[PDB]
Design a protein around this nucleic acid. Structure first.
Lengths: 50, 93, 228
RNA sequence: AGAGCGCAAGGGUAGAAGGGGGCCUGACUGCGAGGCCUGCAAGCCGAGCAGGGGCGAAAGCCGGGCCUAGUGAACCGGUGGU
RNA sequence: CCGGGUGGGGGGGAGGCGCCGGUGAAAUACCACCCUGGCGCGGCUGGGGGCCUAACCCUCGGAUGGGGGGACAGCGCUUGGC
RNA sequence: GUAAGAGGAGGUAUAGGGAGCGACGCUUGCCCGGUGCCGGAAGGUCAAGGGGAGGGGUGCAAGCCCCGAACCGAAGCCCCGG
RNA sequence: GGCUACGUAGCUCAGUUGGUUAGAGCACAUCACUCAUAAUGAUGGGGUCACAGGUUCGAAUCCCGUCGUAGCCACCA
């Protein structure tokens, strides 16, 4: 439900993506998880958009 | 009707006001799709000008009145006499 | 009498419908200072960011690639070790945590504060009713929370400026000092334009650069083609 | 093993799936042998390869949750990119 | 805000003020813009009323006109509603 | 009746159209909450229009074309009472 | 969706551009007055100004984020 809602994660260093979910209710401020983009190896990943 | 000048007779059905509701984009469209059909017809009016030896009227188009006064100008140039209202008015043009 | 005699002549030199730009302003407004001493070029800058917008009142922290000449003395509350740094900079009696009452128990003579982030916390909670509200205490962007804020002590001893918005963007850029002629006026004003464009809001539509009024301090000022 | 394993029951499980701590973020990418299932469609399962990544002394596990419900082909378009 | 501020006319005259100190959030001549509310105008831009007739419309024993209404009414296009 | 015009009526609020009841005798109680209807020159919402702060394509440029805020644009429904 | 207004004591309602010192009638409370109830006067309990954030030294008085309430236009592959 939109409370857990649905958001996506983009890398810094210009764009990139990966598919995820959230949980605003739970102590969920923002997120800087650590994944892999299409280009190169594993890196940052920043939280953004709907 | 039909103007005595440059035609200007009615228009019907798929003339239009349609209705529609129409498409664009303001989401998936303004309201997307939208569609219907209607009716539409011209203008006409009255110009009862004197000129020459008598008085005469006109069924003038929306914006073809200066043309009427022009016909007046051409009218003055010739011999417009006797008693014959629309009869003269026709010899005009 | 109303605006004085000096300002009636100095009125017959404004023609309140002019521009000058940074150039003619530099020169003729270098003249527009016949009053006392070191009139501060008061670039008076006004824009449009709705006198708060929650967090859009600039801060702009600038030195104007020259110098002022006045004094701030900083004081600093720099937890012993940081005192050392400030001790080769310009910070009077740096007092680790003790010159706090020489601010709080009524003993002024200072500006800025630089202090630290350490004591910031501590020393924030004490004088945040005077230096804070009025304009000295930390404001973590007014050159007052750090040890790289001592490099900033030299920054504040070469020019701080704290561009804020109050009710009109307003800010009064300070240099001019009626002893700088063409050169330093040109370069100073242009520099301020630079820092100006540097600190920008995130979507506040309008004229980012109306009022400039480049008044020395005692006279005329009419705009600078708010750009060049 | 009658406890627990979110939620209904069923299967199962203390040689762990349960309960405590440390590092983390494999709800990974490009693919997929060969099988479940089945009118179509869709759904289920997965070794390995390869990039690189977490943890592990290693051996090694990792394509979320012990598993079965928490789901909607297409047409329309919204939004970021190529 | 009943406290004084703001302005002009004058008498008359060589004399009258601003910082710190003091107080509080702030210090009060002067200078810069701006806000509050107002007031006058200049650009744009509308709301409301009167008078006029000559568009348009009514009528009176033929009327080239007199009398009534009149920029609405009638209509043409378009605008949203019911 | 698309219309010209027609009936109304060469009649004029004791006159003309629409509705409920149905001689005459008695009589016609409470509710304006939902709605219909009457009015009400403050106002919310909303149209094309009017306007132009602001953005873009493109030409070297002059320019051309599109997007468009503030704010003024009705009926109406909401609102107000009967 | 977009725009608008309101939500503060158990009830019902003001204080609204600050800067003070958060109220009113009902009701509860122990009284007072009357020989007697009621009428009314007094003192207390109840606000946690729709919840937070930020503006200010100092907001229930302002901008902002979430919801609840309603109003019209208006969206729904």
């Amino acid at each position: 439900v939109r409370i857990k809602l649905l958001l996506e994660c983009t890398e810094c260093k210009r764009r990139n993506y990966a598919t995820e979910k959230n949980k605003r209710n739970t102590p969920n401020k923002l997120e800087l998880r650590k994944y892999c983009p299409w280009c190169r190896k594993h890196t940052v990943h920043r939280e953004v958009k709907i | 009707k039909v103007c005595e000048i440059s035609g200007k007779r009615p228009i019907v059905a798929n003339s239009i006001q349609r209705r529609g509701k129409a498409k664009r984009e303001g989401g998936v469209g303004k309201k997307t799709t939208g569609i219907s059909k209607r009716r539409q017809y011209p203008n006409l009016q009255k110009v009862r000008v004197r000129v020459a030896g008598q008085e005469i009227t006109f069924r003038v188009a929306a914006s073809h009145i200066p043309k009427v006064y022009e016909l007046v100008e051409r009218a003055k140039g010739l011999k417009l006499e006797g008693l014959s209202p629309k009869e003269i008015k026709k010899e005009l043009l | 009498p109303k605006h004085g005699k000096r300002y009636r002549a100095l009125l017959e030199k404004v023609d309140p419908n002019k521009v000058y730009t940074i150039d003619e302003a530099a020169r003729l407004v270098k003249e527009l200072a016949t009053a006392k001493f070191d009139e501060t070029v008061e670039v008076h800058a006004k824009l449009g960011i709705d006198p708060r917008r929650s967090d859009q009142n600039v801060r702009g922290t600038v030195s104007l690639p020259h110098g002022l000449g006045k004094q701030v003395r900083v004081l600093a509350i720099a937890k012993g070790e940081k005192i050392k740094e400030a001790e080769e900079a310009g910070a009077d009696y740096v007092g680790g945590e003790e010159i706090i009452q020489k601010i709080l128990d009524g003993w002024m003579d200072f500006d800025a504060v630089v202090a630290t982030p350490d004591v910031m916390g501590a020393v924030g909670s004490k004088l945040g009713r005077i230096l804070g509200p009025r304009g000295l205490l930390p404001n973590p962007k007014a050159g007052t929370v750090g040890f790289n804020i001592g490099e900033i002590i030299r920054e504040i001893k070469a020019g701080r400026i704290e561009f804020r918005n109050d009710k009109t963007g307003a800010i009064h850029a300070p240099v001019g000092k009626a002893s700088f002629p063409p050169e330093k006026l040109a370069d100073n004003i242009r520099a301020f334009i630079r820092a100006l464009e540097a600190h920008k809001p995130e979507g506040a539509k309008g004229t980012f650069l109306r009022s400039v009024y480049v008044t020395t301090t005692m006279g005329p000022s009419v705009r600078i083609n708010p750009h060049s």
